[PDB]
Amino acid sequence: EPQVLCYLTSWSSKRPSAGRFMPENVDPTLCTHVIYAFATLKDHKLTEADEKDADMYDKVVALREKNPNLKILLAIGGWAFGSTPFKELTSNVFRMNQFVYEAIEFLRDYQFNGLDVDWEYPRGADDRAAFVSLLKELRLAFEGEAKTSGQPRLLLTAAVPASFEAIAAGYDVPEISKYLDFINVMTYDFHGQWERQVGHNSPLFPLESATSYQKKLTVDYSAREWVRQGAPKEKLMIGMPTYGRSFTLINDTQFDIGAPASGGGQAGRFTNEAGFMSYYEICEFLREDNTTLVWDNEQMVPFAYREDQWVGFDDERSLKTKMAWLKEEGFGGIMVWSVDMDDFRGSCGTGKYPLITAMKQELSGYKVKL
Numbered sequence: 630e631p632q633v634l635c636y637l638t639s640w641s642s643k644r645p646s647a648g649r650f651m652p653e654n655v656d657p658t659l660c661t662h663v664i665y666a667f668a669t670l671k672d673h674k675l676t677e678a679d680e681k682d683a684d685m686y687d688k689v690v691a692l693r694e695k696n697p698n699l700k701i702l703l704a705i706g707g708w709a710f711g712s713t714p715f716k717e718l719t720s721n722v723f724r725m726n727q728f729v730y731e732a733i734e735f736l737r738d739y740q741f742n743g744l745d746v747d748w749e750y751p752r753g754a755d756d757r758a759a760f761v762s763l764l765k766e767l768r769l770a771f772e773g774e775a776k777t778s779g780q781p782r783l784l785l786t787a788a789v790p791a792s793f794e795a796i797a798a799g800y801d802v803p804e805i806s807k808y809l810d811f812i813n814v815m816t817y818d819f820h821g822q823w824e825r826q827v828g829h830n831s832p833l834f835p836l837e838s839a840t841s842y843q844k845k846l847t848v849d850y851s852a853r854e855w856v857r858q859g860a861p862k863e864k865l866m867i868g869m870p871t872y873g874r875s876f877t878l879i880n881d882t883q884f885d886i887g888a889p890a891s892g893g894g895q896a897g898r899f900t901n902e903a904g905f906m907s908y909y910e911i912c913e914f915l916r917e918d919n920t921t922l923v924w925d926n927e928q929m930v931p932f933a934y935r936e937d938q939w940v941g942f943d944d945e946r947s948l949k950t951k952m953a954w955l956k957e958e959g960f961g962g963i964m965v966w967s968v969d970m971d972d973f974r975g976s977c978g979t980g981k982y983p984l985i986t987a988m989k990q991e992l993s994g995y996k997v998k999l
């Protein structure tokens with residue numbers, strides 16, 4: 630019963646040419662869940678982020694028409710949304726409750742199967758209580774609307790950080806575990822353009838030369854920290870990135886992990902954002918000349934460089950390494966960010982969706998059990 634929850638970003642539809650991804654481009658046998666990102670809050674009511682999104686919701690739903698057991702969720706929050714929107718929504722019980730009863734109306738109207746909360750991030754005691762308070766009302770009201778209607782309950786999931794620091798600052802793990810259906814651990818962005826050193830986006834294990842703090846910034850330690858803090862293993866969906874984090878090298882000579890960088894590398898031609906790159910953009914970069922491909926046998930992930938350009942990413946191999954690890958640890962499934970940044974056009978040379986397909990064939994036959 631391993632679950633595969635795939636985030637679909639709404640702004641990928643605004644990509645230039647080949648890059649452009651519509652809910653039509655989703656393979657409905659790929660994932661078990663499709664999470665649309667993101668909605669927004671307007672006057673503390675779950676609402677559309679643009680009037681162009683309303684029809685988008687309709688087409689990400691009715692993917693069920695090609696796979697009737699596929700679940701379609703709406704995600705709110707995100708890295709850009711911030712905290713302040715949730716801090717406010719969460720200051721009076723009437724504001725909260727009303728958001729809940731009406732989000733239910735909003736979701737049931739679009740035929741959504743549930744809601745994903747991506748508050749990034751709660752910090753501090755009062756924030757912790759609010760996050761529990763919110764997920765509690767949502768879950769308990771979903772359980773109630775299941776009673777009072779004649780329908781199967783709406784799902785409640787949440788995206789949560791990987792950092793052991795972030796876990797402690799804003800997450801009552803035993804409590805949110807009780808009310809959440811799935812716990813989507815964002816096990817990526819360990820390193821990026823916000824640093825002046827070259828580091829990998831999502832390393833499974835650490836370098837043996839790493840400090841004891843750096844040894845905690847891995848997929849392995851973060852997932853096991855959540856377990857350590859009381860997260861049930863069958864609810865833990867470990868995040869798998871279909872993107873890499875790119876760097877501009879201060880020096881073309883130093884390309885090893887830890888090499889100085891001045892910032893993010895050249896933006897991808899489609900994603901239009903430095904320091905990051907989609908997988909179909911990675912393959913492009915790999916087919917350049919004098920582009921070197923390295924495999925980190927300690928961290929069990931690849932990275933590539935050309936001239937001053939450095940990128941660390943996940944391929945078919947590293948992700949399969951991660952599925953082997955995930956099954957040995959006994960986690961309930963995976964979470965993907967994002968489906969629209971995997972090679973959905975099979976232009977890397979491999980098949981369509983090489984990354985998510987690689988993880989899927991490796992999770993085949995697997996049953997969650999302790």
Ligand SMILES: CC(=O)N[C@@H]1[C@@H](O)[C@H](O[C@@H]2O[C@H](CO)[C@@H](O[C@@H]3O[C@H](CO)[C@@H](O)[C@H](O)[C@H]3NC(C)=O)[C@H](O)[C@H]2NC(C)=O)[C@@H](CO)O[C@H]1O
Nearest residue numbers: 636640707708709710747788815818872900901902905966
């Ligand atoms: C569950 C999860 O992964 N959540 C986090 C994500 O929110 C985050 O993805 C980043 O999301 C922001 C929005 O929060 C993206 O900004 C968008 O950037 C595009 C192009 O860069 C820009 O046109 C848009 O204005 C903006 N979106 C909107 C509509 O606001 C950002 O690019 C996303 N990054 C990636 C890699 O997809 C990622 C990682 O930052 O994962 C979690 O952090």
Ligand SMILES: *[C@@H]1O[C@H](CO)[C@@H](O)[C@H](O)[C@H]1NC(C)=O
Nearest residue numbers: 879880881882883884888889
């Ligand atoms: C790049 O690094 C090497 C050492 O690895 C150093 O000797 C060289 O001077 C650096 N490049 C420049 C332009 O300084």
Ligand SMILES: *[C@@H]1O[C@H](CO)[C@@H](O)[C@H](O)[C@H]1NC(C)=O
Nearest residue numbers: 915916917918919920921922
């Ligand atoms: C890049 O330069 C190195 C020599 O430093 C060479 O080994 C390699 O073949 C070149 N090209 C590629 C595609 O790796």
